[PDB]
């Protein structure tokens, strides 16, 4: 992020909920390290805009 404009930066994502995988690459992690919440019994989500 040099002057006024942005060099190349991009904000987009997706998730791997997959069992068994080292994760960190070149010292840094993916961005976070969490174990399974063991999801929804009778909950849901309300999507707005």
């Amino acid at each position: 992020f040099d002057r006024e404009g942005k060099g190349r930066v991009t904000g987009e994502e997706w998730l791997v909920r997959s069992v068994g995988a080292y994760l960190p690459a070149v010292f840094e992690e993916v961005l976070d390290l969490v174990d399974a919440v063991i999801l929804t019994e009778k909950t849901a989500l309300h999507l707005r805009a």
């Binding site: 997959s18 069992v19 068994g20 995988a21 080292y22 690459a25």
Partner: protein, 48 residues
């Protein structure tokens, strides 16, 4: 049988080889563990 090449493949059964601290192919694992009731679940895997 005898092999002069190969990717990743494990095998058990026969034996005369002596687990040499120099080379035991890769790693060695002795005995059969799991009892009767011991159930096991396995995952797919893959990294990166």
């Amino acid at each position: 049988d005898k092999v002069m090449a190969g990717d990743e493949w494990l095998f058990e059964g026969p034996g005369t080889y002596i687990p040499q601290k120099e080379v035991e192919v890769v790693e060695i694992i002795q005995a059969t563990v799991i009892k009767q009731n011991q159930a096991l679940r396995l995952r797919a895997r893959k990294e990166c």
